[PDB]
Design an enzyme around this catalytic site. Sequence first.
Site, mmCIF file in Angstrom:
data_model
loop_
_atom_site.group_PDB
_atom_site.id
_atom_site.type_symbol
_atom_site.label_atom_id
_atom_site.label_comp_id
_atom_site.label_asym_id
_atom_site.label_seq_id
_atom_site.Cartn_x
_atom_site.Cartn_y
_atom_site.Cartn_z
ATOM 1 N N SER A 1 3.519 2.139 8.669
ATOM 2 C CA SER A 1 3.203 1.274 7.531
ATOM 3 C C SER A 1 4.449 0.704 6.852
ATOM 4 C CB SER A 1 2.404 2.053 6.476
ATOM 5 O OG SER A 1 1.115 2.402 6.936
ATOM 6 N N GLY A 2 4.433 -0.604 6.590
ATOM 7 C CA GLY A 2 5.557 -1.245 5.915
ATOM 8 C C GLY A 2 6.682 -1.726 6.818
ATOM 9 N N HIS B 1 0.796 -1.228 0.000
ATOM 10 C CA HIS B 1 0.000 0.000 0.000
ATOM 11 C C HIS B 1 0.834 1.286 0.000
ATOM 12 C CE1 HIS B 1 0.505 0.135 4.482
ATOM 13 N NE2 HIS B 1 0.323 1.431 4.304
ATOM 14 N N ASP C 1 -5.998 -2.973 -3.163
ATOM 15 C CA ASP C 1 -6.127 -1.657 -2.545
ATOM 16 C C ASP C 1 -7.384 -1.465 -1.689
ATOM 17 O OD1 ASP C 1 -8.178 0.284 -4.453
ATOM 18 O OD2 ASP C 1 -7.500 -1.619 -5.283
HETATM 19 C C1 LIG Z 1 -8.258 6.990 2.897
HETATM 20 C C2 LIG Z 1 -7.959 5.558 3.397
HETATM 21 C C3 LIG Z 1 -6.834 4.957 2.533
HETATM 22 C C4 LIG Z 1 -7.570 5.544 4.890
HETATM 23 C C5 LIG Z 1 -7.941 4.436 5.676
HETATM 24 C C6 LIG Z 1 -7.615 4.347 7.066
HETATM 25 C C7 LIG Z 1 -8.067 3.099 7.850
HETATM 26 C C8 LIG Z 1 -9.560 3.263 8.249
HETATM 27 C C9 LIG Z 1 -7.864 1.777 7.065
HETATM 28 C C10 LIG Z 1 -6.886 5.420 7.707
HETATM 29 S S1 LIG Z 1 -6.458 5.331 9.494
HETATM 30 O O1 LIG Z 1 -5.866 6.579 9.936
HETATM 31 O O2 LIG Z 1 -7.601 4.842 10.246
HETATM 32 N N1 LIG Z 1 -5.292 4.161 9.580
HETATM 33 C C11 LIG Z 1 -4.115 4.300 8.713
HETATM 34 C C12 LIG Z 1 -2.819 4.418 9.573
HETATM 35 C C13 LIG Z 1 -2.244 3.067 10.038
HETATM 36 C C14 LIG Z 1 -1.317 2.339 9.215
HETATM 37 C C15 LIG Z 1 -0.821 1.093 9.655
HETATM 38 C C16 LIG Z 1 -1.231 0.569 10.908
HETATM 39 C C17 LIG Z 1 -2.146 1.284 11.750
HETATM 40 C C18 LIG Z 1 -2.534 0.754 13.007
HETATM 41 N N2 LIG Z 1 -3.452 1.373 13.763
HETATM 42 N N3 LIG Z 1 -1.965 -0.379 13.490
HETATM 43 C C19 LIG Z 1 -2.651 2.536 11.303
HETATM 44 C C20 LIG Z 1 -4.101 3.153 7.733
HETATM 45 O O3 LIG Z 1 -4.575 2.065 8.079
HETATM 46 N N4 LIG Z 1 -3.522 3.321 6.342
HETATM 47 C C21 LIG Z 1 -3.609 2.131 5.518
HETATM 48 C C22 LIG Z 1 -4.332 2.555 4.242
HETATM 49 N N5 LIG Z 1 -3.704 3.787 3.776
HETATM 50 C C23 LIG Z 1 -3.360 3.783 2.337
HETATM 51 O O4 LIG Z 1 -3.569 2.775 1.665
HETATM 52 C C24 LIG Z 1 -2.771 5.019 1.700
HETATM 53 C C25 LIG Z 1 -1.242 4.766 1.508
HETATM 54 C C26 LIG Z 1 -0.567 5.935 0.765
HETATM 55 N N6 LIG Z 1 -1.341 6.150 -0.557
HETATM 56 C C27 LIG Z 1 -0.739 5.988 -1.768
HETATM 57 N N7 LIG Z 1 0.595 5.822 -1.849
HETATM 58 N N8 LIG Z 1 -1.464 5.969 -2.911
HETATM 59 C C28 LIG Z 1 -2.816 6.491 -0.441
HETATM 60 C C29 LIG Z 1 -3.503 5.330 0.328
HETATM 61 C C30 LIG Z 1 -3.368 4.989 4.536
HETATM 62 C C31 LIG Z 1 -2.983 4.620 6.002
HETATM 63 C C32 LIG Z 1 -6.500 6.572 6.888
HETATM 64 C C33 LIG Z 1 -5.721 7.779 7.463
HETATM 65 C C34 LIG Z 1 -4.540 8.187 6.545
HETATM 66 C C35 LIG Z 1 -6.655 9.001 7.649
HETATM 67 C C36 LIG Z 1 -6.853 6.606 5.501
#
Ligand SMILES: CC(C)c1cc(C(C)C)c(S(=O)(=O)N[C@@H](Cc2cccc(C(=N)N)c2)C(=O)N2CCN(C(=O)C3CCN(C(=N)N)CC3)CC2)c(C(C)C)c1
Length: 241
Positions: free
Chosen positions: A191-192, A42, A91
Amino acid sequence: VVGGTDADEGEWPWQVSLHALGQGHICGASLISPNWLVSAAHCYIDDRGFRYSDPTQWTAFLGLHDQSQRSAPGVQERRLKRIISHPFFNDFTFDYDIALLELEKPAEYSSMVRPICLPDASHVFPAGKAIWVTGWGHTQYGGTGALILQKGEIRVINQTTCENLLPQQITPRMMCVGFLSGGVDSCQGDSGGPLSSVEADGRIFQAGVVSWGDGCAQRNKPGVYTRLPLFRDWIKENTGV
Ligand SMILES: CC(C)c1cc(C(C)C)c(S(=O)(=O)N[C@@H](Cc2cccc(C(=N)N)c2)C(=O)N2CCN(C(=O)C3CCN(C(=N)N)CC3)CC2)c(C(C)C)c1
């Protein structure tokens, strides 16, 4: 990382920091060999304003401790030659959220830069086992990233409980790790990154990849991670590792 503390310098020599051209730290990764890193698919999805899928748009910092000190002694900087997202990555569901990044030039092993061990395909990290999550991600949901690498201790959660906590969202490639009460969890920017599991002889193995979570450290919303054992063969066939 929410609910953690500062890691000691060089405590997680396999933890890598990934910067995107002009954006600073975006994702973490893990050193698994001299030329390969493991990360989450992602992180490399293009969007209308930036080609995250292009290996040339990234910089990998190995041996880093503080984001504000990226030139410190021991820190290595490397560019990416290739980014291999799992062909089955999705995705929307986030199934198969794993990626292999090939370094442009070999990493140099030192006390601050060392690969994490990879678990065999049949290995199972048991429910309840203490695992370590690390990263420069937000230290609070709705907060800001961390300058100093963070570490938090969490626990592997029963798959059934996981599926039930996040209905219609958990696949067999995913694993819940954390606490039902929250408190400690990875978060944005983590992430990652890898989950580090201390094994039978003290050596550390990657138990997972920080993938997603509903918010961060929220009650009944533990972080979801991509399992590693299931991809041992995939890693070998693509990297030779
Ligand atoms: C707009 C969408 C995708 C979005 C979804 C979420 C969740 C509801 C799934 C969130 S979030 O806060 O509840 N969580 C983030 C941060 C995160 C990350 C990892 C672990 C944890 C944990 N609590 N253990 C939390 C989250 O699970 N993500 C995953 C999905 N995501 C993406 O896939 C983006 C990556 C960068 N990108 C591109 N390069 N194209 C765009 C898509 C973002 C972070 C958010 C946040 C950013 C508001 C967004």
